[PDB]
Amino acid sequence: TDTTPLKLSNELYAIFKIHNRPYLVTEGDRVILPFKLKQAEVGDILNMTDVTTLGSRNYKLVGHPINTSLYTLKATVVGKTKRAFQTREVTKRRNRRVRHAKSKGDLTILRISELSMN
Amino acid sequence: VVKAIARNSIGRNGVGAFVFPCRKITLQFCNWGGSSEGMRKFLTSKRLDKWGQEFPWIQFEVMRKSGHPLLRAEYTNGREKVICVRNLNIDNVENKLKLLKDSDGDILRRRTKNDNVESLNSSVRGIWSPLHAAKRHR
Amino acid sequence: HPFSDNYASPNIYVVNDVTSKEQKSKYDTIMKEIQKLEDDATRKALETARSA
Amino acid sequence: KQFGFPKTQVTTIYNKTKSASNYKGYLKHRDAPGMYYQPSESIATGSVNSETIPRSFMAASDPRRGLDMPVQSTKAKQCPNVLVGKSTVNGKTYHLGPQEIDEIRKLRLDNPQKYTRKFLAAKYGISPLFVSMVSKPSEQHVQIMESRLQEIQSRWKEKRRIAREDRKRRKLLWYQA
Amino acid sequence: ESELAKYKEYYQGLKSTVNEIPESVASKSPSLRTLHKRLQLPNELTYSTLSRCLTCPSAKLPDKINNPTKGAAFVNTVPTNKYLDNHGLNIMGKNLLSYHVTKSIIQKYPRLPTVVLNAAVNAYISEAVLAHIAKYWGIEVETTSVLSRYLKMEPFEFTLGRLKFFNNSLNSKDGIELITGKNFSETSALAMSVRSIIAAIWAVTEQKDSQAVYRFIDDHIMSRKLDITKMFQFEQPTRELAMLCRREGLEKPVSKLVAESGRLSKSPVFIVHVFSGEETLGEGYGSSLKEAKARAATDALMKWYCYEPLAQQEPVIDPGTVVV
Amino acid sequence: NSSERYKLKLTKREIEVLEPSVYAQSYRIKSSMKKATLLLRLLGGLDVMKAISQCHFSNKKIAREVAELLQKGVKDGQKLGLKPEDLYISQIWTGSDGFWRKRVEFKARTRIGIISHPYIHVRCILRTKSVTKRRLAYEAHLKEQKRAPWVQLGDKPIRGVTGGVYKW
RNA sequence: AUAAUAAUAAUAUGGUAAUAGAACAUUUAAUGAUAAUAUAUAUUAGUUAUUAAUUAAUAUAUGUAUUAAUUAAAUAGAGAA
RNA sequence: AGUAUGAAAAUGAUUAUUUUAUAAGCAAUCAUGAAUAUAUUAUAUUAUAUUAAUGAUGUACCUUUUGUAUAAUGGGUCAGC
Numbered sequence A: 001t002d003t004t005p006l007k008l009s010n011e012l013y014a015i016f017k018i019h020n021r022p023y024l025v026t027e028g029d030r031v032i033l034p035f036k037l038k039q040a041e042v043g044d045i046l047n048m049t050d051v052t053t054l055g056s057r058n059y060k061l062v063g064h065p066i067n068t069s070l071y072t073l074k075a076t077v078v079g080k081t082k083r084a085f086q087t088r089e090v091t092k093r094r095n096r097r098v099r100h101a102k103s104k105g106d107l108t109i110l111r112i113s114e115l116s117m118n
Numbered sequence B: 001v002v003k004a005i006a007r008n009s010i011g012r013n014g015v016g017a018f019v020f021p022c023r024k025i026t027l028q029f030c031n032w033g034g035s036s037e038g039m040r041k042f043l044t045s046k047r048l049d050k051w052g053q054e055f056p057w058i059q060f061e062v063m064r065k066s067g068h069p070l071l072r073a074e075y076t077n078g079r080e081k082v083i084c085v086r087n088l089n090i091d092n093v094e095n096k097l098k099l100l101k102d103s104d105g106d107i108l109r110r111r112t113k114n115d116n117v118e119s120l121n122s123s124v125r126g127i128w129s130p131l132h133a134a135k136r137h138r
Numbered sequence C: 001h002p003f004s005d006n007y008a009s010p011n012i013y014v015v016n017d018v019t020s021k022e023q024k025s026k027y028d029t030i031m032k033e034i035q036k037l038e039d040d041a042t043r044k045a046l047e048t049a050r051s052a
Numbered sequence D: 001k002q003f004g005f006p007k008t009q010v011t012t013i014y015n016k017t018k019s020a021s022n023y024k025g026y027l028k029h030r031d032a033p034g035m036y037y038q039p040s041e042s043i044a045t046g047s048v049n050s051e052t053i054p055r056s057f058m059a060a061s062d063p064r065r066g067l068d069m070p071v072q073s074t075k076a077k078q079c080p081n082v083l084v085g086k087s088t089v090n091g092k093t094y095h096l097g098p099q100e101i102d103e104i105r106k107l108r109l110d111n112p113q114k115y116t117r118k119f120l121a122a123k124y125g126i127s128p129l130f131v132s133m134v135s136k137p138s139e140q141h142v143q144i145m146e147s148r149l150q151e152i153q154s155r156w157k158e159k160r161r162i163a164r165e166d167r168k169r170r171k172l173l174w175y176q177a
Numbered sequence E: 001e002s003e004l005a006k007y008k009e010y011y012q013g014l015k016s017t018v019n020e021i022p023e024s025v026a027s028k029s030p031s032l033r034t035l036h037k038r039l040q041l042p043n044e045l046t047y048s049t050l051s052r053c054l055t056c057p058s059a060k061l062p063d064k065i066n067n068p069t070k071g072a073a074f075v076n077t078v079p080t081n082k083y084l085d086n087h088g089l090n091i092m093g094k095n096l097l098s099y100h101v102t103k104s105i106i107q108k109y110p111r112l113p114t115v116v117l118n119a120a121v122n123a124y125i126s127e128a129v130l131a132h133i134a135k136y137w138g139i140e141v142e143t144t145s146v147l148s149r150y151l152k153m154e155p156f157e158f159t160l161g162r163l164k165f166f167n168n169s170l171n172s173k174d175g176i177e178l179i180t181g182k183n184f185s186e187t188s189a190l191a192m193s194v195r196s197i198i199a200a201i202w203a204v205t206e207q208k209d210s211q212a213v214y215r216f217i218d219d220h221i222m223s224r225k226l227d228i229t230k231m232f233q234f235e236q237p238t239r240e241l242a243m244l245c246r247r248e249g250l251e252k253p254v255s256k257l258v259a260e261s262g263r264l265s266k267s268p269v270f271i272v273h274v275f276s277g278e279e280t281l282g283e284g285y286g287s288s289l290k291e292a293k294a295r296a297a298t299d300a301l302m303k304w305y306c307y308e309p310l311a312q313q314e315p316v317i318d319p320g321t322v323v324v
Numbered sequence F: 001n002s003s004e005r006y007k008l009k010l011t012k013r014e015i016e017v018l019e020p021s022v023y024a025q026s027y028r029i030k031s032s033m034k035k036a037t038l039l040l041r042l043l044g045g046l047d048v049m050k051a052i053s054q055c056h057f058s059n060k061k062i063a064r065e066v067a068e069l070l071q072k073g074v075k076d077g078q079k080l081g082l083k084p085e086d087l088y089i090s091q092i093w094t095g096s097d098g099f100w101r102k103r104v105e106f107k108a109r110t111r112i113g114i115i116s117h118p119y120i121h122v123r124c125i126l127r128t129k130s131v132t133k134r135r136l137a138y139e140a141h142l143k144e145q146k147r148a149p150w151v152q153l154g155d156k157p158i159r160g161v162t163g164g165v166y167k168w
Numbered sequence G: 001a002u003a004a005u006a007a008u009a010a011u012a013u014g015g016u017a018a019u020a021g022a023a024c025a026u027u028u029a030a031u032g033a034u035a036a037u038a039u040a041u042a043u044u045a046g047u048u049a050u051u052a053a054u055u056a057a058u059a060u061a062u063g064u065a066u067u068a069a070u071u072a073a074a075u076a077g078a079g080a081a
Numbered sequence H: 001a002g003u004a005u006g007a008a009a010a011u012g013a014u015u016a017u018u019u020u021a022u023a024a025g026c027a028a029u030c031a032u033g034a035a036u037a038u039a040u041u042a043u044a045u046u047a048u049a050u051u052a053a054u055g056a057u058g059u060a061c062c063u064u065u066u067g068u069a070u071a072a073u074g075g076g077u078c079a080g081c
């Protein structure tokens, strides 16, 4: 795998997958995972492993999952949080009972700190 | 001839040095007031010390007031969460405190489907153009 | 009755339980005392002026 | 061609002509593991990208010069000239001496209405821009012209003034990059 | 006894602590400790030094205290020691910022125009930006009065931990600012504090790890996003491009239509490329032909200036700005 | 007589209120609110003198009362310091004056209605052409300056979510 | 051998008539610190898996909660007569 | 039908912001441009709030019925009961 053009390029993107959910990122990008991370606390660093695609403007390395040796991709866990609280009402059409389906899903804000060809 | 446009930089907290979002937490209780029992117990019982030991970048203020028991956090962005912990047991209070410390200070917000990544960066590949496409349309 | 010393981790502290009323009373006494001090000094200055 | 990577379109599993916006089809499309050449489907106007910069603007010791990515897709022989000056089509001429210049200057001060820039250009086989560069007119003439322009501007409606402002804003925006 | 005397002795003690910044007192201050832990400052950087960095110069109380009727009262801070403030530190921090940031920018963009470079530098380390950074870190201002503090009966440790300058009480009350100098502005004080911290870090680490300060700066200041392409504003870019081509060993640039669509419409599209020989320099799209031509020239100039070489390359020293 | 500079911070509401105005009020006019509206809509943003003239030559009964009110507001403005040729009617509205006495209308074949007898008041706020109108002209000018132009081939946001994948 | 909280694996969680379990708002009675830096009510914007309460600002009242909490009870919750 | 107080709502007029004169149906929800307002950490390529560009989905509520968008019942609206 001649990975020289990617290595050379100033701009570079990745399409890493957490639980088969793809997230297309550059360095500085701020990923918002739609679940509560249990393993990592806030401040902890995540070394991304299942990286599908690593792309320049005109080239892209692709692997499933690209060789871990070829690249780096460090995310930082920058705040577990939640979505806004919502209460949709559930009811049938001639029935006074109206069940409130309250919802407030969890989020985990990552920040892609490092992304480079090793 | 070339001229500058005065413009300012955007801080990405994570990339260089991570500054921890939660900066200060205030435990507020009442000596009277049966709603403040679990808070009082928490303050008493060696959990707060352990917490402070764990997180020495957060300062833990402990205040007494007449009203309900309060957990007000204070974040780097300047926002302030305040959770009323009325009638909660010790463990519930601790969970609430954990939740607060976990939070990045930002306001709660509805996200649309797949609104995942938030970039300041211009696209690595360009924006599409019909004149510059690989397959020309008809 | 918690204190800042009680917790033994220096990022933890307990703010001082001084009642609002007591603080107000203290303020009243201090500003009053200043006023008394000032008034006596002004009187003295008036007496000195009268003398010469 | 330095690199002999296989080249790929940005491939959907669905019909691209009917469902170009459908991200799901793109997500589905898996391609075999390795290096590829995906030529960008974009103009390189705003890009500071290293694959976009031309080789002449790269430094001599730059490794990127040798690599084949600033692709010369277009050909200057095939493209026609746009808003090109007459000097660029048939070369610049440095023929007029000091005496001729002095005469031109004398003429312009004397009577800019009679001896206008275009007339001077026609006489001496040179550009109106060059005439301007050479010689100032009488400041009175300039003042008159400014006054005329102001009068014209005043003669406008509200709408026209707004349109002119918009045009000016657009022009300013062009030079931003 | 008298409460005035009690207050007076407290004030005197506070003044003495400010003069000293005794190490034990600084250590006791929770806010300082948390700041230290947050930034991951070196262990050699003492807590007294950190307190000092937050202490702005304030030798004498100004004349504007005499009248709150004119819209100012300075009743929060207490006079400082002449030889224990953030002033010398601040200057050193400013110098460091001016050196390192500028150097980093030059490394990134070795041909960047002088004015553009200056603007970029400003963006990275402007006073407002520095103040914002300080706020983010948690450098809070001593807004509370001395008397109020005494009444509450709070320790001097908290005071030491907060930022200390002649902050005008009733600054914008009833919507009335007084427009005082830089020595009474909050933003300026916060900027000084962030520069002073940097200077303190430098002082402690220089002999052991010389580049520790610069990696701290990189982490905090140089980590911030700035698209350099948004900084530029050209005037007559075609002429400038032609001059550049003349200067280098390049053929005269001419603009040519590559592609065209929607001529005779409200919004056409004209793609023009500025060629020098067979090589294209800049690509320019536009609604008009003229616009497209202009855009191609601007693109070419961007590519010239914002060229960023690799770290593996030997240093690129540019041949100055293209003087048209 | 001082070297102290200042910068004033006001809100939008504060700005609005502090501009010189004058607040006319009618007495308990005998009319409907609808009938008042039918006239008062004509006297929207007029100069006070023009409005007074219109009221004088109006066929309606409320008109005289409106004219009188305008005259009173002018007089008040003069007393304050303002000029009558400077004053324009900024706002003029009406309202129920309360205590409308209901009274049964007896109809044929043991039917009834209730006849109310409406009383209203007209209030109006006169503002100055010299200040308020100038201010809102300035605001309009600023807004015009701010306004981003129509660009033909302009940068519109690529609306929709990306979907973790390049489509180009 | 319990309780609270948190993990893991599993199963379950549509619901009229109906049955069962658990809460909250409101008002009164018993007990009851505190205080205009306070309390109550209202508006706006935040916060807590949110009929509820809490934070801040603003407004009006009051030298002040039959207040928090536990019990006892109810003229205890209204788009349907 | 006490006395004070009263930004409780329905309801009327007026002003401001915003949308609206080639577009068709419970008038909402979700997507999504734009405009405006506020914001003593908008550092911004910022955040919230308001607003019928445009797109998609969407047959009031209750009662009574095997079954109701029903052109079956009942309600002019809000306040108190």
Ligand SMILES: [Mg+2]
Pocket: A091, A092, A093, A094, A095, A096, A098
């Ligand atoms: Mg229903």
Ligand SMILES: [Mg+2]
Pocket: A094
């Ligand atoms: Mg049914």
Ligand SMILES: [Mg+2]
Pocket: D018, D019
């Ligand atoms: Mg299809």
Ligand SMILES: [Mg+2]
Pocket: F098
């Ligand atoms: Mg009344």
Ligand SMILES: [Mg+2]
Pocket: F106, F107, F108
């Ligand atoms: Mg009759």
Ligand SMILES: [Mg+2]
Pocket: F114, F116
């Ligand atoms: Mg009637």
Ligand SMILES: [Mg+2]
Pocket: none
């Ligand atoms: Mg069920």
Ligand SMILES: [Mg+2]
Pocket: G075
């Ligand atoms: Mg009842």
Ligand SMILES: [Mg+2]
Pocket: none
């Ligand atoms: Mg009711």
Ligand SMILES: [Mg+2]
Pocket: none
């Ligand atoms: Mg209901």
Ligand SMILES: [Mg+2]
Pocket: none
């Ligand atoms: Mg239309």
Ligand SMILES: [Mg+2]
Pocket: H024
């Ligand atoms: Mg219709």
Ligand SMILES: [Mg+2]
Pocket: none
């Ligand atoms: Mg019908």
Ligand SMILES: [Mg+2]
Pocket: none
């Ligand atoms: Mg019906």
Ligand SMILES: [Mg+2]
Pocket: H075
């Ligand atoms: Mg009916």
